[PDB]
Design a protein around this nucleic acid. Structure first.
Ligand SMILES: C[C@H](P(=O)(O)O)P(=O)(O)OP(=O)(O)OC[C@H]1O[C@@H](n2cnc3c(=O)[nH]c(N)nc32)C[C@@H]1O
Ligand SMILES: [Cl-]
Ligand SMILES: [Cl-]
Ligand SMILES: [Cl-]
Ligand SMILES: [Cl-]
Ligand SMILES: [Mg+2]
Ligand code: NA
Ligand code: NA
Ligand code: NA
Ligand code: NA
Length: 326
DNA sequence: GTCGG
DNA sequence: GCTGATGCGC
DNA sequence: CCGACCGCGCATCAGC
């Protein structure tokens, strides 16, 4: 919040480029600048001062000068007045509706919450659950609630098979005082990069969580990734809790560290780390860290026994989860 | 939109 | 049915 | 300049 105005402006620009212009690289360019500036420990006094930071070039520096000078950006003011851009930006806020679907709906004259509701027929499953919980998915989750959710998930998982290990990642593992959703990394000894000795390992867990009425809806579901909705149970006479988004990722047990590194994030941290990896001649995914041959082709997985080993490989000092919120 | 070679 | 591309979201 | 921009699971489609 030290340079809140500037980062907000940058985030709005990033969203515009992503949702309206469908220019993902500009989207990421703006996000990185925002990230770098949110981390800067000084109140920015000029675009020149900001341009010193990596990721902030001439264009953004110019915008920062205008913002500091007037408290706003003409480019944005105009975008806000544009109906198409506004409608497209809004629709993309529905889980399941991306830039393409948003622009398509706007072409059909579907541009509002009211319109989406009376046109459910034109939505796929995911988009339909997204509209249903539009309001709720906008709400933040207090860490105190995340703690109750963690308690239920781990205990329910324990009831299915004592050997399951459920770990809450995302911003929660990064120590956030509030989270946008719940991310759960799951492992079982029967599922390794070597073999799958038991089927339905994820399904059994999802089923058990639906049985106790914790998971209420399913956005998408596969053998290793579940994306859906959950809700804490409420007491007698009390308003029930908002529905929350929940992601569950089943990863080979022997690949836990690369998995927990990935799922802990942040997303920008992961992008920065994976890019650095490349520069160092390594490629990193949620399963392994592999070296890049002279040709540039991924080699065999390198041994990993902790998150720090991954950091060591790329010559980065270890950063605790709480310091990976970029 | 920003960067490094 | 399949495979491969595209959208979406993590 | 100008090529690079992280890497992937699931849903849905086109084309066979
Ligand atoms: C602050 C967010 P919340 O609290 O509001 O939920 P969060 O939990 O941090 O992010 P979530 O969107 O929940 O995704 C979970 C993780 O997935 C990883 N992740 C997400 N997007 C990406 C991506 O584009 N790339 C990679 N490599 N990892 C990603 C890193 C993320 O941490
Ligand atoms: Cl782009
Ligand atoms: Cl503005
Ligand atoms: Cl690992
Ligand atoms: Cl791999
Ligand atoms: Mg999260
Ligand atoms: Na810079
Ligand atoms: Na969306
Ligand atoms: Na979110
Ligand atoms: Na998530």
């Amino acid at each position: 919040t030290l340079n809140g105005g500037i980062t907000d402006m940058l985030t709005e620009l990033a969203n515009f480029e992503k949702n309206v212009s469908q220019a993902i690289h500009k989207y990421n360019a703006y996000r990185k600048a925002a990230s770098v500036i949110a981390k800067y420990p000084h109140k920015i006094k000029s675009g020149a001062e900001a341009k010193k930071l990596p990721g902030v070039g001439t264009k953004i520096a110019e915008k920062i000068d205008e913002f500091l000078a007037t408290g706003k950006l003409r480019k944005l003011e105009k975008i806000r007045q544009d109906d198409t851009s506004s409608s497209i930006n809004f629709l993309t806020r529905v889980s399941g509706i991306g830039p393409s679907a948003a622009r398509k709906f706007v072409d059909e004259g579907i541009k509002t919450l009211e319109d989406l509701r009376k046109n459910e027929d034109k939505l796929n499953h995911h988009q339909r659950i997204g509209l249903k919980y539009f309001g709720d998915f906008e709400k933040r989750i207090p860490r105190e609630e995340m703690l109750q959710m963690q308690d239920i998930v781990l205990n329910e998982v324990k009831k299915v098979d004592s050997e399951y290990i459920a770990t809450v990642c995302g911003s929660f593992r990064r120590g956030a005082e509030s989270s946008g959703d719940m991310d759960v990394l799951l492992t079982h000894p029967s599922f390794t990069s070597e073999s799958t000795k038991q089927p339905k390992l994820l399904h059994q867990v999802v089923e058990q969580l639906q049985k106790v009425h914790f998971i209420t809806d399913t956005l998408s579901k596969g053998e290793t990734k579940f994306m859906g909705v959950c809700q804490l149970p409420s007491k007698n006479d009390e308003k029930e809790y908002p529905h929350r988004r929940i992601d569950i990722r089943l990863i080979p047990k022997d690949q836990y560290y690369c998995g927990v590194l990935y799922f802990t994030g942040s997303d920008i941290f992961n992008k920065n780390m994976r890019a650095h990896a490349l520069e160092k001649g390594f490629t990193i995914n949620e399963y392994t860290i592999r070296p890049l041959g002279v040709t540039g082709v991924a080699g065999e997985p390198l041994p990993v026994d902790s998150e720090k080993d991954i950091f060591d490989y790329i010559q980065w000092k270890y950063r605790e989860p709480k310091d990976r919120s970029e």
